[PDB]
Amino acid sequence: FLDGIEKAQEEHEKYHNNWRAMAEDFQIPQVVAKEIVAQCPKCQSPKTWQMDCTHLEGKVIIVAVHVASGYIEAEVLPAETGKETAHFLLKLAARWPVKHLHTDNGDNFTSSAVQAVCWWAQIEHTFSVVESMNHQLKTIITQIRDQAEKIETAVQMAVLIHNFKRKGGIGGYSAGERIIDIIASDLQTTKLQNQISKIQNFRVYFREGRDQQWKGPATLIWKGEGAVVIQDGQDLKVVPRRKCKIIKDYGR
């Protein structure tokens, strides 16, 4: 156990590993490995989208793209007012978690209706990838145009072929697998951070061997079934449970 913590600290001092790899290699819990990463001075987005409008056959196609994965959602608009752009943004924010929207300085994007939608759904709008996505979507649309009667069917068939049928990148994944893996990794991070804060609201008085007195207040990191890991004096150490007292702390 403590040998695993010592090997993890020496290996991070050499190579600066991440906490998932250290927890899987050295067989330590994840809160301990995250503390080892968080104590290092040299070691201290999944919700950003971009939007654009374009033209095809006299129609208006609005395109939104998830940036870290390349994931496309598109639609055909009857006009280019601010109310239709606000309805598209409200549908997108109701289906995927959107926190940061990046657009250009168009007219319909600089509007009171889009501003009201961003106020209600709590999005950060920023005015200045989508050009490459418009070119790629237009090549697929021309590649499958003879199978559809209307332009709306061809647009949605091209979105399906782009998202699930084209493979590339490092491991040969599509865009849907990449967006799902990215958001799932972020969810794991936030749940572990909630556990970390709830544990770190405590305090530990511990008694070393060959002494009767209690030492200073060390902060609890992990409380197991038979052992206790504490941080004290910028040092992580493992004390048995029969030489410890854990009390609540009020130091806000």
User: In the range 130-159, which residues lie near a copy of itself by CB under 8 A?
Assistant: 143-144, 152-153, 156-157, 159
Among 28, 50, 69, 85, binds a copy of itself (CB under 8 A): 69
Q: Is 21 in the site for Zn ion (CB under 5 A)?
A: no
Select from 23-31, 38-46, 106-114, 124-132 the region that touches Zn ion (CB under 5 A).
Answer: 38-46
Between 19-26 and 2-15, two packed helices, what is the crossing angle to 10 degrees?
140
Phi-psi region of 122 (alpha: psi -120 to 50; beta: other; left: phi over 0): left
Evaluated on CA atoms 101, 104, 106, 112, the torsion sign reads positive
Smallest gap from Cβ 209 to a copy of itself, in A, equals 31
Which one of Zn ion, a copy of itself, none is in contact with 245 (Cβ closer than 5 to 8 A by kind)?
A: none
Q: Is 123 helix (H, G, I), strand (E, B) or coil?
A: coil
Q: Are strands 100-103 and 227-232 parallel, antiparallel or unpaired?
A: unpaired
Q: Describe the strand order of the beta sheet including 235-240 as a list of residue ranges.
A: 235-240, 227-232, 217-223, 202-206, 244-248
DSSP type of residue 50: E
Taking the C-alpha atoms of residue 18 and residue 159, their distance in angstroms, rounded to an integer, is 36
Among 2, 21, 38, 40, binds Zn ion (CB under 5 A): 40
Q: Is 39 in the site for a copy of itself (CB under 8 A)?
A: yes
Under the rule (CB under 8 A), what is the footprint of a copy of itself?
A: 14-18, 20-21, 24, 34-35, 37-39, 42-44, 67-70, 73, 87, 90-91, 93-97, 120-121, 129, 143-144, 152-153, 156-157, 159-161, 163-173, 176-178, 180-181, 183-184, 187-188, 191-192, 194, 248, 250-252
Q: Residue positions in the annotated binding site?
A: 12, 16, 40, 43, 52, 104, 131
Under the rule (CB under 5 A), what is the footprint of Zn ion?
A: 16, 40, 42-43
